[PDB]
């Protein structure tokens, strides 16, 4: 909930997906295909996957 309350619970999916790239991978999103792939996974399988 430390990560979830701060970076997921009050932002949209674009801010959340780009914050995942900054925190976990340490780099910025590369194209629109990286974001349109990840949010499809979020809607299909939830935040844990």
Ligand X SMILES: CCC1=C(C)/C(=C/C2=NC(=C\c3[nH]c(/C=C4\NC(=O)[C@H](C)[C@H]4CC)c(C)c3CCC(=O)O)/C(CCC(=O)O)=C2C)NC1=O
Contact between 9 and ligand X per CB under 6 A? no
Tell me, rounded to whole angstroms, the distance of Cα 25 from its chain centroid. Answer: 11
Among positive and negative, which fits the CA dihedral 24, 14, 8, 41?
negative
**Gap between the Cα atoms of 26 and 1, Å rounded:** 21
Q: Which of 8, 19, 29, 38 binds other proteins (CB under 8 A)?
A: 8
The listed partner (ligand X, other proteins, none) that binds 40, CB under 5 to 8 Å by sort, is ligand X
Q: Is 19 in the site for ligand X (CB under 6 A)?
A: no
**Contacts to ligand X by CB under 6 A:** 12-14, 35-36, 39-40
């Amino acid at each position: 909930d430390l990560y979830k309350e701060r970076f997921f619970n009050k932002a949209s999916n674009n801010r959340f997906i780009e914050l995942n790239f900054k925190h976990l991978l340490g780099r910025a999103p590369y194209n629109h295909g990286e974001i349109q792939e990840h949010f499809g996974l979020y809607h299909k399988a939830g935040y844990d996957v």
